[PDB]
From a paper:
STAT3 is ubiquitously expressed and activated by various interleukins, interferons, growth factors, as well as directly by oncogenic kinases such as Src, Abl or Met6–9. STAT3 shares sequence and structural homology with other STAT family members and is composed of six domains: N-terminal domain (NTD), coiled-coil domain (CC), DNA-binding domain (DBD), linker domain (LD), Src homology 2 domain (SH2) and transactivation domain (TAD). Canonical STAT3 activation relies on the phosphorylation of a key tyrosine residue by JAKs, Y705, which results in SH2 domain-mediated STAT3 dimerization. Monobodies are synthetic binding proteins, which are built using the tenth fibronectin type III (FN3) domain of human fibronectin as the molecular scaffold.
Numbering used by the authors:
A (entry chain D), D (entry chain C): -1 to 93
B (entry chain A): 136 to 371, 382 to 398, 400 to 417, 428 to 689
C (entry chain B): 136 to 188, 191 to 371, 379 to 419, 429 to 688
């Protein structure tokens, strides 16, 4: 009936060879804040992370090795009505 | 004297206790855990919020919110366990409560019936109170933890909460349990009775003071002076109670148990289809208690009671009480006498012997009993199985005389209580005897010997004596004298009657009896104590 | 350890108890009597009514006999109501003797405990006295309601109840309400768990804990009272909020004697925004509120913490603790948030005991009289026997000292911090002389041989460090002293102070002499004293 | 205002030489019932008594020795609002 993930959609919208900008359609739940993780696909290079406030619907990642496959994941944390912890959404981009 | 059924109960109650003690500690743990979660989430949010003010987007690690998501999962697994252990407890407690209410308590409600009509009085509701209280404290503890879960849920919840889904039935269950256990613990301890006729409970004459007492077997001090009992009669021929009509349960007993005694009650008829000594009424006692937020209506009632205009009606009334309580155990059957059941002699015999053990040292022998069998049934021996109608026992007259069986006997007992009680005790009155055994018995012994028995000729009930003259054919004839009634015995004691008694056989006055009481006994020895001047 | 004052209280309480037991029994008789009256009047009235349908049923003798028993029970009602007011007075006295004396003594012994030394009596035996009186008051409440019952049933133009009961009720309610508000106490004062020695100082964003008790041990109340905690309820000053788990429900299985407690462990503070006193002098109250409904009586409760200092950063704690020391040493009012607008003055004789406490609270030995009199010189100026001298808040903290860059108290807090975390063993065994005039430092050591040395704290640094001092000797015969630049927290991470001492050497002619240290002060060879602590 | 006797007034209205008839005010209180006593004033003969319902405002006494001084007293019993027992009223009549 409904798409279950944290944000329902996730895309990249502008991109330079060393940085991306991501947008997710604005959530119907009340998100306290999101985590954003990106890492080289298959690597044992550890994963990079930062937070964005629930306010926002986009962040920029930078410092990307240009042509490599990055796995980008967005997590959300909800407490407003009750605690939620929705399952996240990922995409793969190479720049 | 403790049965095995009871020492097992005693164990179930201690098992229920420790079960709830364990849950109470399991919830300090599940409370700790959700506090830990909630605290950490908010601290890590005001921090992943406030330091975003100053530019910083790397304060709160994903590791620490995988660790938080995981401790939410843990406590849901614990909430899950707890709510099913709780329902597990509730089932244990529903079982223990049947075995209290439907067995051990119903056994007392009955032993009480037997006690009322003369039987061994088992009563002592003490050990029954301790079991009910032990289970009610357990249930209260349990109530507090099921409210505890409501508290936890407001604080911390989520889409699948085991509490949102299962608690509502856990509450429903523990409330029905507690409400029902309190309604069952509200019992009439001493059944209504006019103080001047103690042997005749459940018969109330109008305009006479009677008394009754209720107990509540949940020994919770929270409830002292908190419950006002309103007594009445015939709640929806018909009556009212007058006097002091509300009383407030206190614990100044006995064992500091929650009682409330009504003295100061009388009945008045108000302004009609079954004869009055068979028309039954209930005296109901109502109160309400508010306990830690729970309203709990209470209502118990007396055993059915016969209500009468005049004291001449009491033998028929008591008959009705004997017939009711001997035969049913339903406490609220007002319409019992529209289709009375039948009783076996083997039950009726024990009740009659009780009307004489209840009131005197002796009770009735098997010779005495078997001759009363002949009065109810007709001739025979070993009546064990024979059955007895309400009509044979009181409603219809007997053996072509003008009166009931029961009325004859009530009046005889009344006579043995108030006059000649000393002679009944100690067995100088062989009261119930066939004329043929009266003869066969005395034939054996010398011609002066004599015997004391009750009249069969009068509703009123009197006593007489019988001796044996012997004749020229060699046969033994009996003589009995016109029996001495309540009206003769006000002016002389029966024993004094016996010493002084003489008869005129030709000429002059000999002492007919004044020689021996049945078994070889000089007369002075047997009634010398009552001569006095 | 029982006072005589207390065993007399213990007697008053058994006396109030049997007084009320007697009244409850005196009211079973007064109840019996009015039942007898009422029953007989209605009996003889339905009879002198029903038989009129025969006008000689009810004798005038029997209505004189009734009139006279009404009079009797009014004479009894009269007696009861004054015995009752008699009881109420007895109970008001016992209650000021509990609230205003024995309880106020504990509320204070608690203040002292908070700033070091004499850890108080537990509340257990204070609880049993308060419950003993509350049960007595309850029993009394029930009998004053009993009289309301009797009145509805049987009354008349002069009723002693109609006239006097209303004040009897007023009295027993004020008594009970007040005894319960007084029994609602903070048992363990707010405190951050990782700075136990610093109660009543709360850093923002750190978890702290506090615990309340209710000293009326009535099981009727288990799981019935939800305590809401907050801060800055209801001034030209800063405001905060509590975050975390903010309500708790008093139970009885948490405490060993089954007492009614409620422990808050998940509390933190956050400052709130808006438009007097530096922050280490600005005081706040943490308040705890609940409501109880007991047998028809509503009873609002509210108690609060001792005043607490709230700080941004841990560098602020020595000033904060100074404020707590100054407050609790000097006043016993628990709610004076504006104490520091006109701080009072203290005598040295009381300041001395508090400083020795800052060292007994935290270690195996407090401060000596030599150690103490040399801290006197730091606060006042030169002299001997300071007993009366008075000490300002300005001399103690707030203003710097003896023309150095820092407060007295800050210097000492930092020294204590150093004694706690490094060097604690040597303090405990009394190998550190610590506080000593330079002149006694010289006079003391001159008697002794040229190796001998002593350990003392730096006076040069807020930071707080230790050093040692020894005696070279010169041709005139005089004794010279050397001290070394003191060893701070920053040096002692990498070597233990005892290791420093043994290994230490400085220069002779051209080669690094070997220790200038040889003996610890009173005739004691160096290895003998610091061998235990080296490698 | 005031006057505390149970009936406020009491008089005899008709009389034969062996009997009297007495009337009092209907009472402002709610009288359960009254007692009526009459006795020969010096007489150490005992006093005679009977009841009338609160309903009534008159009773008849009879069997009087004609010329003798009788002391007549009326008592009332009140419980309606609360128990009362007002003081009684007596008069002396000789017939």
């Amino acid at each position: 009936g409904s798409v279950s993930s944290v944000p329902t959609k996730l895309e990249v919208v502008a991109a330079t060879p060393t940085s991306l900008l991501i947008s997710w359609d604005a959530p119907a739940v009340t998100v306290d804040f999101y985590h954003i993780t990106y890492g080289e696909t298959g690597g044992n290079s550890p994963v990079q992370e930062f937070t964005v406030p629930g306010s926002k619907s986009t962040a920029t990642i930078s410092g990307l090795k240009p042509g490599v496959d990055y796995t980008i994941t967005v997590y959300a944390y909800v407490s407003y009505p009750e605690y939620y912890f929705p399952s996240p959404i990922s995409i793969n981009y190479r720049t | 004297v403790v049965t095995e059924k009871q020492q097992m109960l005693e164990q179930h109650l201690q098992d229920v206790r420790k079960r709830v003690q364990d849950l109470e500690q399991k919830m300090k743990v599940v409370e700790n855990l959700q506090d830990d979660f909630d605290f950490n989430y908010k601290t890590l949010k005001s921090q992943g919020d406030m330091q975003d003010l100053n530019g910083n987007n790397q304060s709160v690690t994903r590791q620490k919110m995988q660790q938080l998501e995981q401790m939410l999962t843990a406590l849901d697994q614990m909430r899950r366990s707890i709510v099913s252990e709780l329902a597990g407890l509730l089932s244990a407690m529903e079982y223990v409560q049947k075995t209290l209410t439907d067995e051990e308590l119903a056994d007392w409600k009955r032993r009480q019936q037997i006690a009322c009509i003369g039987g061994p009085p088992n009563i002592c509701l003490d050990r029954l109170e301790n079991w009910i209280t032990s289970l009610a404290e357990s249930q209260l503890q349990t109530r507090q933890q099921i409210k505890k879960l409501e508290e936890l849920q407001q604080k911390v919840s989520y889409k699948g909460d085991p509490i949102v889904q299962h608690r509502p039935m856990l509450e429903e269950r523990i409330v029905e349990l507690f409400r029902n256990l309190m309604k069952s613990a509200f019992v009439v301890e001493r059944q209504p009775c006019m103080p001047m006729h103690p042997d005749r409970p459940l018969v109330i004459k109008t305009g006479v003071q009677f008394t009754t007492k209720v107990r509540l077997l949940v020994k919770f001090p929270e409830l002292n002076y908190q419950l006002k009992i309103k007594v009445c009669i015939d709640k929806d021929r018909k009556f009212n109670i007058l006097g002091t009509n509300t009383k407030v349960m206190n614990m100044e007993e006995n064992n500091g148990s929650l009682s409330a005694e009504f003295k100061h009650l009388t009945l008045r008829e108000q302004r009609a289809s079954l004869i009055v000594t068979e028309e039954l009424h209930l005296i109901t006692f109502e109160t309400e208690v508010y306990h830690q937020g729970l309203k709990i209506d209470l209502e118990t009632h007396s055993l059915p009671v016969v209500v009468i205009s005049n004291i001449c009606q009491m033998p028929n009334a008591w008959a009705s009480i004997l017939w009711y309580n001997m035969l049913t155990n339903n406490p609220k059957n007002v319409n019992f006498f529209t289709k009375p059941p039948i009783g076996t002699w083997d039950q009726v015999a024990e009740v009659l012997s009780w009307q004489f053990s209840s009131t005197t040292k002796r009770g009735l022998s098997i010779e005495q009993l078997t001759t009363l069998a002949e009065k109810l049934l007709g001739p025979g021996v070993n009546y064990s199985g024979c059955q007895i109608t309400w009509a044979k026992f009181c409603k219809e007259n007997m053996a072509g005389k003008g009166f009931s069986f029961w009325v004859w006997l009530d009046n005889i007992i009344d006579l043995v209580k108030k006059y000649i009680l000393a002679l009944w005790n100690e067995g100088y009155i062989m009261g119930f005897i066939s004329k043929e055994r009266e003869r066969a018995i005395l034939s054996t012994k010398p011609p002066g010997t004599f015997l004391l028995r009750f009249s069969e000729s009068s509703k009123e009930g009197g006593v007489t004596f019988t001796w044996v003259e012997k004749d020229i054919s060699g046969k033994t004839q009996i003589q009995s004298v016109e029996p001495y009634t309540k009206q003769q015995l006000n002016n002389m004691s029966f024993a004094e009657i016996i010493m002084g008694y003489k008869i005129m056989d030709a000429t002059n006055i000999l002492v007919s009896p004044l020689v021996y009481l049945y078994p070889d006994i000089p007369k002075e020895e047997a009634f010398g104590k009552y001569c006095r001047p």
